[PDB]
Amino acid sequence: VLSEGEWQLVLHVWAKVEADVAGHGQDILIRLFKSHPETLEKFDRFKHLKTEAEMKASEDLKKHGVTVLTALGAILKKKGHHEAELKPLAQSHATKHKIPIKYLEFISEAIIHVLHSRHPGDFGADAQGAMNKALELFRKDIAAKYKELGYQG
Numbered sequence: 001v002l003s004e005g006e007w008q009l010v011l012h013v014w015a016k017v018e019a020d021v022a023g024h025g026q027d028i029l030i031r032l033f034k035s036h037p038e039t040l041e042k043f044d045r046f047k048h049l050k051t052e053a054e055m056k057a058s059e060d061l062k063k064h065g066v067t068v069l070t071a072l073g074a075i076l077k078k079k080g081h082h083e084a085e086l087k088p089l090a091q092s093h094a095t096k097h098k099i100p101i102k103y104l105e106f107i108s109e110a111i112i113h114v115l116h117s118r119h120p121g122d123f124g125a126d127a128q129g130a131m132n133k134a135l136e137l138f139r140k141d142i143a144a145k146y147k148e149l150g151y152q153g
């Protein structure tokens with residue numbers, strides 16, 4: 001469970017992200033795909049992209065980055081009271097998109113890295129640890145739903 005002070009660190013940096021949701025979403029998905037190419041293969045929508053320049057030029061990838069970060073921002077702003085938001089996300093990601101929990105760890109690392117690059121003054125070690133806790137809580141709660149449905153592994 002995050003403390004109130006931890007949540008404030010998380011949402012303080014997240015308010016900075018929302019100034020350029022689309023740029024963040026591009027950086028995050030590109031980092032994910034580059035660092036963990038098995039993740040790109042899960043997207044029929046994106047798997048034609050073979051270079052970082054092609055990824056950066058894709059408007060559809062930029063659009064999806066906004067979809068992803070909007071859903072995550074809505075979860076973070078619930079400060080842990082996010083059951084209604086995780087149900088459908090866990091259901092689609094386990095049963096339709098077939099995304100292992102480990103890949104959620106990978107995108108969590110990408111999010112932390114890009115927040116660090118873009119917001120160093122609001123993403124010192126305290127805020128990095130708090131965002132890591134928030135993303136762990138996200139993964140923990142999604143993993144419990146995957147387990148329910150027979151997909152935790």
Ligand code: HEM
Nearest residue numbers: 039042043045067068071072088089092097099103104107
């Ligand atoms: C912070 C973590 C994530 C969030 C908040 C998120 C959010 C979303 C949302 C809101 C959608 C559209 C609605 C839906 O299908 O549920 C979506 C679609 C999808 N997501 Fe995620 N996602 C996350 C992580 C991942 C990861 C790590 C992968 C793959 C490695 C992935 C793969 C997909 C795929 C394949 C789709 C469908 C894309 C399409 O063809 O339109 N997601 N995601």
